[PDB]
């Protein structure tokens, strides 16, 4: 719906960054508006294809940049968001590289490019590695530059070290997956012993393990994140790929709650009290690298929130499968880390339908993100393709042209507007009300045939986030068979606010309204009782009220 196609060269911005802009077309009588917080803050002509823009540098800021044209009013031609942060961890927008064969240095760079597009900051490299017990394929004098993964694909060292490059010239950071505590049946005896591993029981007979059947060469068997000699095995590891590939950090990931396992010694494993320690143990051993661990269903989420992590992450599973179970994950793990951390989500969408090749549900993938990005969240769902399992190569579902587009338009606001959103504040519910019955208006959290009104108390602004779930046919947030509604957009519908404090500005946006560009509203207030109209609600509108 966008006349214009507006990009950044980068995905981030360090404070002194210059911006520098393309746009794919220009018109006349045009004028590129930059905003702080609906605020303007400078505007110049629409004067080429190529242009670029020093920020303020004031650090951790989202502006919007809108390009206008004048009609003989203004139309917005078309949007991007950008992110001034010196570093990726306040506001973590995550991706994913899969696939590290013989791939083209320009075609990895459409992928980075891509990728850039959605202002990814940070990237998890899933299944690079050799093995999960030796995740650098040779040595560090003799790095081995082909090897094959636990699906015996082919991994070339020259497409993961092509890949951190192209990420680090796009300002992201690049992660390694591997488990905290994960051994293939090729281990080496000799250096991870009897003792180390976790067991089924106590007599340290049968090993736990989580068994993968073919094209996977072995199942995953399973150490004690505690033990020292484990942790300080694992930190030789870690060091041998940090000298041999550029990495930022260590993705730890895990493989859940194992129920009641053990110990060599018979007691229990106690999994989720003994990654603090893992954790403190591998940042000891490389203070310079990041780590980010994923709480698999919150497994371990309160005992780590508190430990040497950028942000927390969350790889979302029954019974968690409500709206109102992102939102959950998401007051839980602000509280967990005492309001230090946002949060990622892991949360495939489609899952089901993913079973074959076919198209990701464009309406069910546009709500969950609404949901998430309105609450403060951020989703791990793009790299060469949309996630659709956890197995991140898996590549059955396409997005549509219109969910691309979407979509971008949904990264581009949550990046804008993420000092309102996730920068700290209150959330309370708004004193509101439809003034003219065009929208059945409801809290959070939400019910079918119901707008959801979420309100949050940022500095000296009031948000008001409206959440449209009129059409929806479930609150299941994974919509695993592609079933949810495209909602019907409500156009101009008249709220009415109670807000004690004399109003000077409102203003709305949406991801689904003129880019997400602000538009300031009318509005009378007669003492406590203000009105106002809100131009279109379709998925997801914000009101801000200063």
Same mark, same amino acid.
């Given at each position: 719906?966008?006349?214009?196609?507006?990009?950044?060269?980068?995905?981030?911005?360090?404070?002194?960054?210059?911006?520098?802009?393309?746009?794919?077309?220009?018109?006349?009588?045009?004028?590129?508006?930059?905003?702080?917080?609906?605020?303007?803050?400078?505007?110049?002509?629409?004067?080429?294809?190529?242009?670029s823009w020093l920020p303020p540098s004031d650090d951790?800021?989202?502006?919007?940049?809108?390009?206008?044209?004048?009609?003989?009013?203004?139309?917005?031609?078309?949007?991007?968001?950008?992110?001034?942060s010196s570093d990726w961890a306040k506001f973590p927008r995550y991706g994913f590289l899969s696939e590290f064969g013989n791939i083209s240095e320009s075609d990895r760079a459409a992928v980075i490019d891509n990728l850039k597009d959605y202002h990814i900051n940070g990237i998890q490299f899933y299944d690079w590695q050799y093995r999960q017990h030796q995740p650098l394929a040779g040595t560090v004098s003799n790095p081995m530059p082909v090897w094959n993964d636990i699906i015996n694909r082919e991994v070339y060292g020259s497409t993961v070290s092509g890949y951190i490059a192209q990420a680090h010239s796009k300002n992201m950071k690049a992660m390694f997956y591997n488990l905290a505590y994960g051994v293939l049946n090729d281990y080496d005896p000799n250096l991870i012993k009897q003792q180390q591993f976790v067991y089924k029981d106590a007599n340290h007979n049968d090993k736990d393990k989580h068994e993968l059947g073919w094209p996977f060469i072995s199942n995953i068997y399973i150490?004690?994140?505690?033990?020292?000699?484990?942790?300080?095995?694992?930190?030789?590891?870690?060091?041998?790929?940090?000298?041999?590939?550029?990495?930022?950090?260590?993705?730890?990931?895990?493989?859940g709650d194992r129920g009641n396992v053990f110990r060599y010694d018979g007691t229990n494993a106690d999994l989720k009290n003994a990654f603090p320690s893992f954790i403190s143990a591998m940042k000891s051993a490389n203070t310079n690298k990041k780590l980010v661990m994923?709480?698999?269903?919150?497994? *371990?989420?309160?005992?780590?929130?508190? !430990?040497? %992590?950028?942000?927390?992450?969350?790889?979302?599973? @029954?019974?968690? +499968?409500?709206?109102?179970?992102?939102?959950?994950?998401?007051?839980?793990?602000?509280?967990?880390?005492?309001?230090?951390?946002?949060?990622?989500?892991?949360?495939?969408?489609?899952?089901?339908?993913?079973?074959?090749?076919?198209?990701?549900?464009?309406?069910?993938?546009?709500?969950?993100?609404?949901?998430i990005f309105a609450f403060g969240?951020?989703?791990?769902?793009?790299?060469?393709?949309?996630? *659709?399992?956890?197995?991140?190569?898996? !590549?059955? %579902?396409?997005?549509?042209?219109?969910?691309?587009? @979407?979509?971008? +338009?949904?990264y581009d606001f949550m990046t804008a507007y993420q000092n309102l959103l996730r920068d700290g504040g209150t959330y309370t519910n708004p004193?509101?009300?439809?003034?003219?019955?065009?929208l059945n208006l409801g809290s959070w959290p939400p019910t079918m045939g119901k707008v959801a009104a979420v309100g949050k108390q940022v500095g000296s602004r009031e948000i008001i986030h409206?959440?449209?779930?009129?059409?929806?046919?479930?609150?299941?947030?994974?919509?695993?068979?592609?079933?949810?509604?495209?909602?019907?957009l409500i156009k101009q519908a008249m709220l009415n606010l109670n807000h004690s404090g004399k109003v000077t500005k409102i203003w709305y946006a949406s991801p689904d309204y003129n880019g997400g560009?602000?538009?300031?509203?009318?509005?009378?207030?007669?003492?406590?009782?203000?009105?106002?109209?809100?131009p279109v609600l379709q998925y997801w509108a914000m009101i801000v009220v200063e």
């Open positions: 719906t966008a006349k214009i196609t507006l990009k950044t060269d980068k995905a981030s911005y360090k404070p002194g960054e210059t911006v520098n802009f393309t746009a794919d077309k220009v018109f006349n009588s045009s004028l590129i508006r930059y905003t702080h917080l609906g605020k303007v803050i400078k505007e110049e002509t629409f004067s080429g294809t190529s242009w951790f800021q989202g502006y919007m940049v809108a390009i206008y044209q004048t009609n003989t009013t203004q139309t917005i031609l078309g949007t991007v968001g950008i992110d001034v150490t004690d994140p505690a033990n020292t000699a484990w942790q300080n095995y694992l930190a030789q590891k870690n060091d041998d790929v940090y000298k041999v590939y550029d990495f930022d950090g260590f993705h730890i990931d895990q493989l994923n709480a698999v269903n919150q497994y *371990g989420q309160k005992e780590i929130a508190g !430990k040497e %992590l950028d942000f927390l992450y969350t790889e979302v599973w @029954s019974p968690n +499968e409500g709206f109102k179970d992102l939102t959950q994950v998401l007051t839980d793990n602000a509280a967990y880390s005492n309001n230090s951390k946002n949060t990622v989500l892991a949360a495939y969408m489609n899952y089901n339908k993913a079973n074959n090749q076919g198209m990701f549900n464009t309406p069910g993938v546009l709500l969950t993100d609404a949901v969240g951020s989703h791990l769902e793009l790299g060469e393709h949309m996630l *659709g399992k956890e197995y991140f190569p898996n !590549k059955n %579902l396409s997005m549509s042209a219109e969910l691309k587009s @979407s979509l971008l +338009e949904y004193t509101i009300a439809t003034g003219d019955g065009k409206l959440l449209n779930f009129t059409n929806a046919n479930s609150l299941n947030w994974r919509d695993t068979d592609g079933t949810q509604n495209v909602p019907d560009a602000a538009v300031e509203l009318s509005f009378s207030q007669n003492g406590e009782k203000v009105n106002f109209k809100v």
